[PDB]
Design a protein around this ligand. Structure first.
Ligand SMILES: Cc1cc2nc3c(=O)[nH]c(=O)nc-3n(C[C@H](O)[C@H](O)[C@H](O)COP(=O)(O)OP(=O)(O)OC[C@H]3O[C@@H](n4cnc5c(N)ncnc54)[C@H](O)[C@@H]3O)c2cc1C
Ligand SMILES: Cc1cc2nc3c(=O)[nH]c(=O)nc-3n(C[C@H](O)[C@H](O)[C@H](O)COP(=O)(O)OP(=O)(O)OC[C@H]3O[C@@H](n4cnc5c(N)ncnc54)[C@H](O)[C@@H]3O)c2cc1C
Lengths: 225, 211
C-alpha cells in the first residue's frame, strides 16, 4: 500500500493536495497494491501537548501517567502506519520560510517510539518516498530567496539521511503568481512551471508504482571481485 | 520591560532556561525597567488548530466570522501586543530532531497572521534589541559529522533578523549531552570550555540589553 501524508491548511484549493493527487492517481493505475492509507495533519493536526508527554515517558512503563501512556500509544500507531507502507507520499507546502508546524509535530512524536529512537536502524530504510512541496515565490540559486526555504533541507535530512528513504522531490514554485500583484512579471514562467511540475508528479507516481519490479530486476549488488 | 519566550519541554532540567536565566538576571539587576513578561510555550503550548483558523478567518467576511476564527485572530493580536510592548526580547529555543521547535514555529506562524506582521509591512520590531539562546546536545561545528545538521538556527536568524529586523545577538551552547550520552565522553574538556564561554556570552548579552 501507499501511505499519503498531507499538511496543507488551505483545504480544497491546496496546490500540494493537487500535485499529490497526480502522484496517487498513477500509483492507483499501475501499483501491484493500489491501496492508499492517508493522514491529513492540516485538517486533523496532532495535539500540541502529546510530544512533551511522550518525551517524559520515553521511564520504566507501568509508572507512566495517563497522558504519557496516551502519548506513546499514539506515537506507536503513527509508526505502525509508516512501517505498513511499501512507499510514502508526503505533501509539505512552504509556510513562513520554514517547516510545517504539523509535519514537525508528527516527526517529533514518531521519534519517541522505540523503533524510531536514536541509535536504531530505520524501519523504513531503502523504501521509496515522493515528497511534494510548493512555494509562493522562486527560491533557486541566483534568486533573492536562495537559502530562504529552511524546510526542504530538514525534510531531506529526516526522510533521506535519518530514515534512509529513496526520496524523489517534486517542487512547484510561483504558486502566488496571479495572487500577489508584485509577482506579475512571473506570469508566463509560472504557467510553464505548473505544466512541467504536474507532469513530474505523474512521472513520480509511475516510478513509485514500478519500484518493486525495478528492485527485483537489479543484479548488481556491489559484491567484491 | 523585557519579553522572555521559553520553548524547552525538559522543565527544571532545561539548559536553554538556565542560559536565558543568565541574561534575565542582568536585566532585573540593572535595567531601569527590570519588569519581565514571560511566555513558556514548552509548558503552555499554543493549540495545534489556532494557526489554520487565523489563516481561514482571513478569507471570511469579518461580520461572518465564526468564534474560533475571531478568537484565533484575537490571540494573534495579543501575541504581537506582547512583542510590541517590550523594549527588548529574550528568546530561548533548543535544537530538537535537527529542526525548529514545534512550539516556536506555531507561535511565529500565528504572529504572522496579524496585520502588523503582514508581508510588505515594515516590522513593528525593527531595530529592537533581542538575544537568542539555543542549545544542542552534540557538536555541529565546521568539519564535524553534524555540520549543516542544525536546520533550526538559520530559520530563527531569518525570522528574527531578516524579517523582523531585530538587532539580534545569538548565544549557542553545544555539547549539552556530554555527561549523559556515553558516545560523547571524548568531548568532556571541550564541553566545559563551551559552557564557560557561552555562560559569559549570555551574561555579556544581558549587560548589553540592560545598559
Ligand atoms: C501562512 C502562509 C505562509 C506562507 N509562507 C510562504 C513562504 O514563506 N514562502 C513562500 O514562497 N510561499 C509562502 N506561502 C505561499 C504558499 O507556499 C503557497 O500558497 C503554496 O502553494 C501552499 O501550498 P498549499 O498546498 O497549502 O496550497 P496553495 O498553493 O496555496 O493552493 C491555493 C491556491 O491559491 C493560492 N492561494 C490562495 N489563497 C492563499 C493563501 N492565503 N496563501 C497562499 N496561497 C494562497 C495558492 O498559492 C494556490 O495557487 C505561504 C502561504 C501561507 C498561507
Ligand atoms: C526530543 C529531543 C530531541 C533532540 N534532538 C536533538 C538533535 O537533533 N540534535 C542535538 O544536538 N540535540 C538534540 N537534543 C538534545 C537537546 O538539543 C539538548 O539536550 C538541549 O540542551 C535541549 O535544551 P533544553 O533547554 O530543552 O534543556 P537540556 O539541555 O536538555 O537540559 C537537560 C540536561 O540534561 C541533558 N538531557 C538529559 N536527558 C535529556 C533528554 N531526554 N533530551 C535532551 N537532553 C537531555 C541535556 O543535554 C542537558 O544537559 C534533543 C533532545 C530532545 C529531548
Amino acid at each position: 500500500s501507499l501511505f499519503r501524508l498531507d499538511t496543507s491548511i488551505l483545504g480544497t484549493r491546496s496546490s500540494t493536495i493537487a500535485l499529490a493527487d497526480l502522484v496517487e492517481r498513477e500509483w492507483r493505475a499501475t501499483a501491484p497494491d493500489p491501496s492508499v492509507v492517508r493522514r491529513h495533519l492540516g485538517e486533523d493536526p496532532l495535539p500540541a501537548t502529546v510530544w512533551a508527554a511522550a518525551v517524559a515517558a520515553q521511564v520504566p512503563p507501568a509508572r507512566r501517567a495517563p497522558e504519557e501512556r496516551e502519548a506513546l500509544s499514539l506515537a506507536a500507531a503513527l509508526v505502525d502506519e509508516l512501517v505498513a507502507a511499501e512507499a510514502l507520499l508526503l505533501a509539505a507546502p512552504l509556510y513562513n520560510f520554514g517547516v510545517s508546524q504539523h509535519l514537525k509535530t508528527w516527526v517529533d512524536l514518531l521519534l519517541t517510539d522505540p523503533r524510531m529512537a536514536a541509535g536504531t536502524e530505520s524501519p523504513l530504510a531503502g523504501r521509496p518516498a515522493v515528497l511534494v512541496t510548493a512555494r509562493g515565490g522562486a527560491y533557486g540559486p541566483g534568486t533573492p530567496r536562495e537559502g530562504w526555504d529552511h524546510a526542504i533541507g530538514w525534510m531531506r535530512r529526516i526522510f533521506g539521511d535519518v530514515w534512509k528513504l529513496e526520496l524523489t522531490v517534486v517542487e512547484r514554485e510561483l504558486t502566488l503568481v496571479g495572487i500577489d500583484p508584485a509577482l506579475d512579471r512571473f506570469k508566463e514562467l509560472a504557467e510553464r512551471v505548473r505544466v512541467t511540475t504536474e507532469e513530474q508528479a505523474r512521472a513520480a507516481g509511475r516510478r513509485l508504482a514500478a519500484r518493486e519490479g525495478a528492485f527485483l530486476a537489479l543484479e548488481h549488488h556491489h559484491h567484491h571481485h
